[PDB]
Amino acid sequence: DDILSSIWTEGLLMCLIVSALLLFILIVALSWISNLDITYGALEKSTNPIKK
Amino acid sequence: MTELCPVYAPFFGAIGCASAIIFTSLGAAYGTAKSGVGICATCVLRPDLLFKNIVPVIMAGIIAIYGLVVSVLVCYSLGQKQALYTGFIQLGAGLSVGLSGLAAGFAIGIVGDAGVRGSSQQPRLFVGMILILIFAEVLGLYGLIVALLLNSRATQDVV
Amino acid sequence: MTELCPVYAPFFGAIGCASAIIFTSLGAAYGTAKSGVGICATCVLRPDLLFKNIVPVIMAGIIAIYGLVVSVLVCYSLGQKQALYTGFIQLGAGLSVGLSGLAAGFAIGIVGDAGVRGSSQQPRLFVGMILILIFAEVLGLYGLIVALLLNSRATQDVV
Amino acid sequence: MTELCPVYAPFFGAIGCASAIIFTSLGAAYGTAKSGVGICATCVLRPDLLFKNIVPVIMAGIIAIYGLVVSVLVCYSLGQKQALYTGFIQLGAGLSVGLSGLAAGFAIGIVGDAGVRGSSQQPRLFVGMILILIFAEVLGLYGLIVALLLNSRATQDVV
Amino acid sequence: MTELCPVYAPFFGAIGCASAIIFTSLGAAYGTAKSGVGICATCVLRPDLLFKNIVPVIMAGIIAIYGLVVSVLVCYSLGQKQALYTGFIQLGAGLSVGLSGLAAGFAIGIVGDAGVRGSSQQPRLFVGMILILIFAEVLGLYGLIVALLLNSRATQDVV
Amino acid sequence: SFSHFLYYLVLIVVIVYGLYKLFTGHGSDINFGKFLLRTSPYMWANLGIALCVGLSVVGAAWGIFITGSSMIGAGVRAPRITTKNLISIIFCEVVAIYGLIIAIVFSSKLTVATAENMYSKSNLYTGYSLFWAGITVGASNLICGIAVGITGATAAISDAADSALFVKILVIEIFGSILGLLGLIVGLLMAGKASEFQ
Amino acid sequence: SNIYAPLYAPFFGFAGCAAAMVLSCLGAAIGTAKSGIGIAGIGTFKPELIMKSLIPVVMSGILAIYGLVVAVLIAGNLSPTEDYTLFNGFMHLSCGLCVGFACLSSGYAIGMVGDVGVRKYMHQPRLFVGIVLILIFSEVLGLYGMIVALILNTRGSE
Amino acid sequence: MEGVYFNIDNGFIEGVVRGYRNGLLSNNQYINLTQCDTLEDLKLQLSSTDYGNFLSSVSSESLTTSLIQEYASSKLYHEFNYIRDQSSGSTRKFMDYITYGYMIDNVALMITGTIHDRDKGEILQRCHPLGWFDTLPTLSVATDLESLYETVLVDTPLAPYFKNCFDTAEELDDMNIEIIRNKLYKAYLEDFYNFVTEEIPEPAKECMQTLLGFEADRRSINIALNSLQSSDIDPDLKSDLLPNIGKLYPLATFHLAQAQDFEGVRAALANVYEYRGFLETGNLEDHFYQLEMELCRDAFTQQFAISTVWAWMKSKEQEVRNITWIAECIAQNQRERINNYISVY
Numbered sequence A: 001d002d003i004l005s006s007i008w009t010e011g012l013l014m015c016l017i018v019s020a021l022l023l024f025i026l027i028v029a030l031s032w033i034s035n036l037d038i039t040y041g042a043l044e045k046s047t048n049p050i051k052k
Numbered sequence B, C, D, E: 001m002t003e004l005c006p007v008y009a010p011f012f013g014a015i016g017c018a019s020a021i022i023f024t025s026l027g028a029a030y031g032t033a034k035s036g037v038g039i040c041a042t043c044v045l046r047p048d049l050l051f052k053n054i055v056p057v058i059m060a061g062i063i064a065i066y067g068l069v070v071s072v073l074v075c076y077s078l079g080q081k082q083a084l085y086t087g088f089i090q091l092g093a094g095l096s097v098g099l100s101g102l103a104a105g106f107a108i109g110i111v112g113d114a115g116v117r118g119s120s121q122q123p124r125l126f127v128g129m130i131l132i133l134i135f136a137e138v139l140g141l142y143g144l145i146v147a148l149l150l151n152s153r154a155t156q157d158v159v
Numbered sequence F: 001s002f003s004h005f006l007y008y009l010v011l012i013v014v015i016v017y018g019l020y021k022l023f024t025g026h027g028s029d030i031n032f033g034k035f036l037l038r039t040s041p042y043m044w045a046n047l048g049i050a051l052c053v054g055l056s057v058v059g060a061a062w063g064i065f066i067t068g069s070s071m072i073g074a075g076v077r078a079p080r081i082t083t084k085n086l087i088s089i090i091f092c093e094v095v096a097i098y099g100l101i102i103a104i105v106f107s108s109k110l111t112v113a114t115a116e117n118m119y120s121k122s123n124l125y126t127g128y129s130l131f132w133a134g135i136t137v138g139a140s141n142l143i144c145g146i147a148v149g150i151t152g153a154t155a156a157i158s159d160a161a162d163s164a165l166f167v168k169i170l171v172i173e174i175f176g177s178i179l180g181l182l183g184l185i186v187g188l189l190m191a192g193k194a195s196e197f198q
Numbered sequence G: 001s002n003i004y005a006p007l008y009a010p011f012f013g014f015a016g017c018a019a020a021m022v023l024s025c026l027g028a029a030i031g032t033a034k035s036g037i038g039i040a041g042i043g044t045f046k047p048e049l050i051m052k053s054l055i056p057v058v059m060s061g062i063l064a065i066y067g068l069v070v071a072v073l074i075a076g077n078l079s080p081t082e083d084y085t086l087f088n089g090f091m092h093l094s095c096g097l098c099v100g101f102a103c104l105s106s107g108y109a110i111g112m113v114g115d116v117g118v119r120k121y122m123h124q125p126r127l128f129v130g131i132v133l134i135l136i137f138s139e140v141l142g143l144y145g146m147i148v149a150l151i152l153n154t155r156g157s158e
Numbered sequence H: 001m002e003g004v005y006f007n008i009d010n011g012f013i014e015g016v017v018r019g020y021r022n023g024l025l026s027n028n029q030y031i032n033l034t035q036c037d038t039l040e041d042l043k044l045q046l047s048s049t050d051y052g053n054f055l056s057s058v059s060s061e062s063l064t065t066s067l068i069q070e071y072a073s074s075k076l077y078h079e080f081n082y083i084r085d086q087s088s089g090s091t092r093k094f095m096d097y098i099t100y101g102y103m104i105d106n107v108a109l110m111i112t113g114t115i116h117d118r119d120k121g122e123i124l125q126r127c128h129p130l131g132w133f134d135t136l137p138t139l140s141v142a143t144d145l146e147s148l149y150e151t152v153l154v155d156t157p158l159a160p161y162f163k164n165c166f167d168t169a170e171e172l173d174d175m176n177i178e179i180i181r182n183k184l185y186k187a188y189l190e191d192f193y194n195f196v197t198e199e200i201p202e203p204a205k206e207c208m209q210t211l212l213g214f215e216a217d218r219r220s221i222n223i224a225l226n227s228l229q230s231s232d233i234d235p236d237l238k239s240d241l242l243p244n245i246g247k248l249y250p251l252a253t254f255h256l257a258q259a260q261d262f263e264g265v266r267a268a269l270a271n272v273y274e275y276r277g278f279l280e281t282g283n284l285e286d287h288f289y290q291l292e293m294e295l296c297r298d299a300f301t302q303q304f305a306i307s308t309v310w311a312w313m314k315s316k317e318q319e320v321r322n323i324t325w326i327a328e329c330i331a332q333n334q335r336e337r338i339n340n341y342i343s344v345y
C-alpha cells in the first residue's frame, strides 16, 4: 500500500503543475497585451486659427 | 505500459510542440502592433521613411520562424510508445524557445516604436536603433540553441 | 477497457476541437470590432474610401477559417475506443491554431484602426498598412501548419 | 498518541497564545500611529495641550495588556499530553481578545485623531472625545471576559 | 520513530527561529527608512538638530535585537531527536516576537517622520515624540516576554 | 478584487482540507516525501535548464528597453551618445550568455538510466540540484538585468547633459554586473559533485 | 536504511542555498538602483559631489557578499555519498531564509535613505555624517541574519 | 518600483523632455543678452542658444518686443503638442488637464469682450492657443450665462465645473465674471488633485500634490488682497472661491476669508513658515515666481516621473517672461531693472 493515491497519482500531479506553469506564463503575456493603447494624437488632423 | 514507457508520456511533447509557436506568436504580435503604430504616425508627415522603418516589423517575424523550426523537429520524435526521458526533453525545448522569444518580441516592440519616432526627428538616429534591436532578435536565438542541444539527446540509447 | 485506450481519452479530443474555433473567433472578433470603429469614423467625411478599408475586416475573418478547418479534421478522428496518445495530438493541434490566431487578431485590430485613420490624411500610408498586416496574418498560418502535421501523426502506427 | 489526547493538540494552543499578543499589538499600533500624527500637528501652535492629548495613546496601550495576561495564563496550561478540548478552547480564547482589540484599536485611532485636531479649536469637545473613546475601549474588555471564562473551563472536568 | 518524536518535528522549530529574524527586520527596515526621510528633509534648513533626531532609528534597532535573542536562544534547543511539543512551542515564540515587532516598526516610522518635522518648528515637541515612541517600543517587548516563557517550557517535563 | 479573492479562496480550501484529514486521523495521507521520491528526476532536471535560459532572457530583454528607450529619446538632441552609451546594452546581454553556459554544462549530465536504479540516492540527488541551480542562476540574472537597465537609463540622460558625468555612473553599472557572476559561481558549486544519471 | 536520513533531504538543502542568493541579490539590486537615481539626478547641478557619495552602493554590495558565504558553506556540506539527515536540511533551509530576508530588508532601507540624502546633500554639506550613521543601522540588519545562519550550519552537522 | 514599468509607455517621452531642459538658459547666458545694445544684437545671441533660427524669416524694422514673445511662445506650444501626441493612457489624461486651465482663462476673456462690444478677431488674437476648443468663438453670441451653458459649454469638459455658479444676475459684468472664473479653478484644482491621488503613481504623486498645492495657495492669497479693493463681501461667499487642498486649508482659509485689511492677512499667514515673509518685504509676485522655480528645480532631481512635463513648461514660460523684460528695457533704453530676471538654472 505504498501508493501515493489512486486518484492523485504522481503522473497526474506532474502534468497539473506543468499546466499550471504554462498557464501562469500565458496569463501574464495577455496582461501586457491588453494594456496596449493607440497613440491617437499623431493620427487626427488638428488645426487652430489662433496659433497657425 | 512499462515503468520506462508510460501512456501519459507524449503529453509533454505535444504540449511542448504547441507552446513553442504559441509563445513566439504572442511575442511577434506585441512587437508588430506596437512597432506598427509608430509607422502609422510618423508617415503622415514623412511618407518617405516608410520602407526604411519596417525593420522592427521584420525582426519580430523572425522570432516566429524560430518557434516554427522547433515545433517541426520535436513533432517527428513523437510516438505512442516513447520513454519519459524523451518527453521532458520535448518539453524543455518548447519552454526554452517560447519563453525566450516572447521576451525578445516585447522588447522589439518597445524599442522599435521609439526608434521610428525619433529617427523622423534625427536621421542620424536610425543606425542607433538598428544596433539596439539586434540584441533583442538574438535572445530568441539563444533559446533556440538550447532546444537544439536537447533534441539531439532525445532518442539516443533509448530502450 | 485497455490500458493504452482508456474511457477518458475522448475528453481531450473534444476540448481540442472546441478550442480551435473558440480562440480564433475571439481574435477574429477583436479585429473586426477594433478596426470597425476606425472605418466608421473616417468614412463620415470621406466615404469614397469605404470599399478600400474593409481589408482588416477581411483578414480578421481569414483567421476564423483556420480554426474551422482544424476543428472539422479532428472531429473525424474521434471515437469511443481510441488511444490516449491520439487525444493529446488533437488537443495540441487546437490550442496551437487557436492561441496563435488570437495573437493574430490583436495585431490586425490595432494596426487597422491606426492605419485607416492615418490613411485619411496620407494616401501613401495605405500601402504600408497592407504589409504590416501580412506579417500578422502569417502568424496564424504557422499555427495551422503545426496543427496539420500533428493531425497527420494522430492515427498512424497506433494500436 | 491517545484518542482523546493526541500529539498534535498543543499546536492549537501554542497558536492561541500568540494570536492574543499578535493581534492586539497590531491594533494598539494603528492607534498610536494615527493619534500620534494628529498630536504632532496640533502641538506645533499650542504646546500647552500636549499632555492632555496623550490620552488616546494610553487607551490603545491598555489593549495590548489584555493580550498579555491571556497569553500568560495559557502558557501555564500547556502540555505534551493534553486533550484537544483544552487545545481548541485556547485557540478561541486567543482569537477573541486578539480580534476584538484589533477593532478597538482602529476606532480609537480614527476618533483620537479627529477630536484632538478639533479640541484645539474648542475646549468643550474634550470631555466628549473621551466619552466616545470609553465605548471603543470597552469592546476589548468584552473579548477579555470571554477569554477568561473559557480558560477557566479548559481544565474543568477533563480526562 | 516514536509517535511523540517524529523525524519531521524539527521543521516546526526551524520556522520559528527564522520567523523571528524575518518579521523584526522588516519592521526595523520600515521604521529606520521613514524616520530617515523625515530627518533629511528638516536638516537642510536646520542641521543643528541631526544628532538629536536619530532617536527614532535607535528605537527601531532595539526591535531587531529582540529577534536575535530568541533565534539564538531556540537554536541551542534544537535537536535531531526531539518532540513535537518542543517544536510547536518554538514556532509560537518566533511568531510572537516577529509579528509584534513588525507592529512597532509601522508605528515608530509613522510617528518619527512626523515629530521630527514638527520639532524643527516648535522645540517643545521633542519630549512628546519620545513618550509616544516608548509606547510603540513597548509592543515588541511584550512579545519578547511571551517568547521567553514559552521557550522555558519547551524542554520542561518532556519525553 | 476578483484576482485577490481567489488567492484567499485557495488559502481557505487548503486549510479546510488539511483539517478534514487531520481530525479524522488521516494527516499522513498528505505526504510530500513520497511525491519527491516517486516523481521522476528527469522532470526536475529539465525544468531547471529551461528556467535558467528562460528567466535569464527575460531579464536581459527587460533592461534593453529601459536603456534603449531613454537613449533614443536622449539621442534626439545629443545623437553622439548612442555609441558611447552602447556599453549598457552589453552588460545586459551578457547575463543571457551566463544562462547558456550553464545549459551547456548541465546538458552533459542528461543520460539514460536503467529502470531498477532510477530512484536511487544519486539520481534523485542530481535532479534536485539541477533544479535549484537553474532557479538560482535564472532568478538571479533576472534581477541583475532589470537593475542594470535602470542604472543605464540614467547614464544616458546624464551623458546628454554633460560628457564628463558618463564615466562616474559606470561604476554603479559595474557593481550591478557582479550579481550575475556570483550566481553563476554558486550554481556550479551545487552541481559540482552531481554525477550523470546511471 | 536510516529513518533519520531519507533520500529527499537534499531537496531542502539546495532550497536554502538558492534562497540565500536570490533574496540577497534582490537587496543589493534595490540599493544600487535607487541610490544611483539620486546620485545621477543631482549630477546635472553638482558633479563634484558624486565621488564621495558612492557609500550607499558599496554597502549594497557587501550585502551580496553575505549570501555568497552562506551558500558556499551549505554546498560544502552536501554530497551524494554522505548520509545527509533530514534535520540538517531543515537547518540549511533556515540558514538561507534568515540571511535572505534580512538582506532584502537592509537593501530597502539603504535605497530609500541614500536617494533622499544625496538629493538633499547638495543643498547642505553638513548633513553628511548623519546620513552615514543612518546607513550603518541599515547594514547591521544584514549582519544579524548571518550571525544566526552560521550557528544553524554548525549545529545541523554537529 | 519606479523604473520597472515606467519605460513601457513613457521612456521616449522622458528622454525628449529632459533634453528640452538642457536648452534652458543659464545665468551666464542671461548676462550676454543683458549687455546687448539693440534687438538686432539680441537676435544674433539667441542663435547660439537652443532657440536657433526662430527669427530667420524676419527683417530689421520688423523686430519688436511683441513679435519676439510670439515666436518664443509658439516654439513652446509645438513642443507641447508634439509630446501630447506621442502620449497615451493616463499620460494623455494628465496632459489634457493641463490645458483645462488655459481655456477657463479664454472663457472669461471672450465674455468680457462682448460686454464691451468688440470683434472676435480682435479678441481671438489675445487668446492663449492651448486653451482652444471648437466652440470658443461662439461665446460671442449671448450675455446670459444659462444661454451660454446649454448651447455651447455642455459638450465641453468644463460642464462639471459650473455647479456652484448658477447665482449670476440677469445682466453680466466684470466683477461677476471674475467670480465665475475663480469658482472654476476651485473645482478644477480639486478634480486634478484627486485624479493624481488615484491613477498617477509615485514619486510623481508626491511632487504634483505639492506643485498643485502651491497653485492653490497662490490664488487664495491674491483673491483675498483683491477683495480689499472692494467695499464689503460676506465671509461665506469667499469660502466658495478658495480651494481646499494646500497647506493653508483648513485653518488659514478660515482666517483669510475673515480678513478686513492687510494686517488681518499677516495674522493668518504668520502661522505657516513656507509663506511667512512674502508680504513683509519686497514685491509679492516675484516671491512666488522664485518659489515656483525652486520646486520645479527639485522635480528634476527625480527620475521615472511624469511630473517633469509640468516642471518643464513652467520653467520655459518664465524663460519667455525674462526675454521680454530684457527686450523692453533695451528698446526703451531703461536699464535700471534689467537684472530683474528670475533664474535658478
Ligand SMILES: CCCCCCCC/C=C/CCCCCCCC(=O)OC[C@H](COP(=O)(O)OCCN)OC(=O)CCCCCCC/C=C/CCCCCCCC
Binding pocket: A006, A007, A008, A009, A011, A012, A015, A016, A019, A022, A023, A026, B008, B011, B015, B018, B019, B022, C008, C015, C095
Ligand atoms: C468542466 C469541463 C469544461 C471545462 C474544460 C476546460 C479544461 C478543464 C481541465 C482539463 C484537465 C483536467 C481534467 C482531466 C484530468 C484527468 C485525466 C486522466 O484521467 O488522466 C489520467 C492520467 C494518469 O493515469 P494513471 O497514472 O494510470 O492513473 C489513473 C488515473 N487517475 O494522467 C493524464 O493523462 C494527465 C493528463 C492531464 C492533462 C491536464 C492538462 C490539459 C492541458 C490544459 C492546458 C491549459 C493551460 C494552457 C497551456 C498553454 C500552453 C500550451
